[PDB]
Design a protein around this ligand. Structure first.
Ligand code: JY0
Ligand code: JY0
Lengths: 306, 306
């Protein structure tokens, strides 16, 4: 038993991280087969990042302008091209550690593992959720750009995120691996800010199921409610509406605990209206929304990966 | 910026995990050079685990009784011996992925990364603290025994923990890699339970410094206090006493924020006596004690590992 915020083993991604230096900018790249993927703003300078024309900026670059280092081994760049907000640097060596992978874009509400990196060297790993406002509450310092987010399914690494920038509230914004930003953000210096967020309702319910599975039951109750009457309370507390599909997804959890989904909603209603009255749930004094139904099932059952 | 509970990259440990099967017991082992380390209760059966005599149990075993599988490759056992509560299974192949490593025993208050494993296959990674009562609040299901805890310093993996069992409150107990249990626990079936815990005071202060570094300042105040008057409040709220050495360790954090250590104590005093009044710190509604001063400095500065 136990429930902890848990990331995927990072080893398969660690073997793909490299360092990309261009000019006086250094960041991380992702080396898969004979391509290194990195944020395009590596070609920018300090005055460029005011209103750049990345298309103009890249035509003025050379292959030899890109210093790519895999550990203490230099990689020779033999081609470059831009895909939306990422660069694709073709190198003369396929990464022998290329795992099976896919480039997948995730939905707000979904989680992934972030391998934070500096100078091509992995620093730490942690779990993140894509917020409804397409930001992520990560931990990123100067030099972390190009760190990727990912999920692992058996042996296949689905890359979903590449880090680009920090917004002024301290949250983080980036792209999928095809270079398309999550949310209404751009890789140039503007006054852009996060935008209004909401609580991921289905994840809170999944986490309440994780709690019940792990012996925290004090928030349970005999009440019930309709989906409609629940969604009126959700909208008042800035929670996302709950759909019938969310109820279906919660089915396995409901059946394992014997607590019907709408019963758990009634529990969440009371939690939202009364607070916790000094108690905790899974060691938290807040309702947690960064665990998906899949995350709970995975951890309260025990899946692995080769 | 940002502050998230962050584990070390797990890749170096992933390449050491294997599966050890003996009889109808299967668990994880740690393969370093030509030795596989695993919990000794792999030699036990269901009736054995009532009051075993592991010494008697092992003399009746053969090398061929131990099925060790590294991925889809079998490892041939050529010797076995017991070190306290761990087995040492000598195999005919050195692990070519053996990182530089050390076996280190940690102190309550210190943190480490756990690579949770099932059937020799890594499942997830997360950060844990050794509680004052020598338990860890982990996430462990049937088959996770032999999963290890570790820290990484540049390229060297200091293994500190090997998982053995779950206590009835849902917390976890294990050994250092020399087979010596953390705390007053045994690898046989008794009514043993966790014992009284306390809050790691120095870690809470380090986390309050992480908050200030990240822009949460509402809990700051102009008050101060003596170390003595603080320790009277700590003892009332079941906090560990704060020593002058803890103050010294907090020096770098104090100097970077400009908040003297004893000023932060005065802030913690008020937090303990008044609560948070509906506010949060680093996204928590509780005072967090599972980040060491080193963890905060590492994350609020950005160290990496090759
Ligand atoms: C890339 O390594 C860098 C990562 C951020 C630095 C701090 N935390 C990060 O996530 N990205 C940038 O520096 C971008 N700018 C940016 O994040 O500005 C806000 C900021 C906050 C705190 C410290 C520094 C910066 C880049 C340079 O800017 C564009 C993406 C618009 C080109
Ligand atoms: C080894 O894989 C196993 C891991 C625990 C199972 C559940 N969570 C764990 O951490 N260790 C054991 O099964 C030990 N017993 C034990 O933990 O009993 C309590 C328990 C709680 C919940 C589910 C199952 C068991 C071993 C078998 O017992 C001795 C170490 C005393 C021999």
């Amino acid at each position: 038993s136990g429930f902890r915020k848990m990331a995927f083993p990072s080893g398969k991604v660690e073997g793909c991280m490299v360092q990309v230096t261009c000019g006086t900018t250094t960041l991380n790249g992702l080396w898969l087969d004979d391509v290194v993927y990195c944020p395009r703003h590596v070609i920018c300078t300090s005055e460029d990042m005011l209103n750049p024309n990345y298309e103009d900026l890249l035509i003025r670059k050379s292959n030899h302008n890109f210093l790519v280092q895999a550990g203490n081994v230099q990689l020779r760049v033999i081609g470059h091209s831009m895909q939306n907000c990422v660069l694709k640097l073709k190198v003369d060596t396929a990464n022998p550690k290329t795992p099976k992978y896919k480039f997948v874009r995730i939905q707000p509400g979904q989680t992934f593992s972030v391998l934070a990196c500096y100078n091509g060297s992995p620093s730490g790993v942690y779990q993140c959720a894509m917020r409804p406002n397409f930001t992520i509450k990560g931990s990123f310092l100067n030099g972390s750009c190009g760190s990727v987010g990912f999920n692992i399914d058996y042996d296949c690494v689905s890359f979903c995120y590449m880090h680009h920038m920090e917004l002024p509230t301290g949250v983080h914004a980036g792209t999928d691996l095809e270079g398309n930003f999550y949310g209404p953000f751009v890789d140039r210096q503007t006054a852009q800010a996060a935008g209004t967020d909401t609580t991921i309702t289905v994840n809170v319910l999944a986490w309440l199921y994780a709690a019940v599975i792990n012996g925290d039951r004090w928030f349970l109750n005999r009440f019930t409610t309709t989906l409609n009457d629940f969604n009126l309370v959700a909208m008042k507390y800035n929670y996302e509406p709950l759909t019938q599909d969310h109820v279906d997804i919660l089915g396995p959890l409901s059946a394992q605990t014997g607590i019907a989904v709408l019963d758990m909603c009634a529990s969440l209603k009371e939690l939202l209206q009364n607070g916790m009255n000094g108690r905790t749930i899974l060691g938290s004094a807040l309702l947690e929304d960064e665990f998906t139904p899949f995350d709970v099932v995975r951890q309260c059952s025990g899946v692995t990966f080769q």
